[model samples]
Target chain A: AMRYVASYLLAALGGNSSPSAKDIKKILDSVGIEADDDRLNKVISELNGKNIEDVIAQGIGKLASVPAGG
Target chain B: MASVSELACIYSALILHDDEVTVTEDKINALIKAAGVNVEPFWPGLFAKALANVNIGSLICNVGAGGPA
Candidate 1:
């Protein structure tokens, strides 16, 4: 799932405003990673029309609040 | 931008999802323990509960998919 998400981000960063599953799969294929249809489709559906930057920013905020370490 | 603790939990949850195993505090903690990562005890349960009904696969895929613009 992390790899898939990374691939999606890479595709977006490469200039595709809204990357398709095929786009993400292509990036993964280059790295010899196999793509899961079910998981890939879900990613596509959830991110269908959302802004990548905004999502990442929100994620940063969410992650920052998590208590970690001993 | 994920913290160590958050990433650990998220990775553990992903591992479970990848294996088609149910995501729970116990399972997440098991992975964290095996990894020897020091995560606050509550983190596992927090992640488990937050992701209980969430599609983790989608969350990962859409990691950069939405927010205030």
Candidate 2:
């Protein structure tokens, strides 16, 4: 899943505001990594039209709610 | 866990992006070489092409916010 995320980020970074499954697959393929279609579709659908940065910021904020080992 | 080759490519890509250098296969490979990490031959190209046009800094800053779990 992290690899898929990384691939998505790479595609997004490459100037595609909305990266497609094909874009993600291309990156994964370059590294000889096989992508699961269902998972890739899920990633694409979830990220569709949302600002990646904003989503990340929200996640960062949510981290505060997680209890850490003190 | 992420594979070593994948992680190395990612870290190398980040290093290049951090330095404000253009991410390319050669540059990624150079960093990997300097770090003495063994990555598959195709990994650098994969990352370089993926990151070739986007604002990597922004992506780095906002990592873990988007995408599937």
Best by DockQ: 2
Off by over 4 Å in 2: A1-3, A57-70, B1-69
As for candidate 1, its clashing pairs are A55-B66
lDDT by residue for model 2 over B1-69, one digit each (tens)? 234555556645644543345677877766555444546777676667667775444333334434466
TM-score of each: 0.41, 0.42
Q: Rate the local accuracy (lDDT) of all candidates.
A: 0.53, 0.52
Instruction: Estimate, for each residue in B1-69, the C-alpha lDDT of model 1 and write its tens digit.
Output: 434555555545554544345667876666555444435667677667767677554444434554346
The clash number for model 1 is: 1
Instruction: Quote model 2's TM-score.
Output: 0.42
TM-score, candidate 2, first chain: 0.65
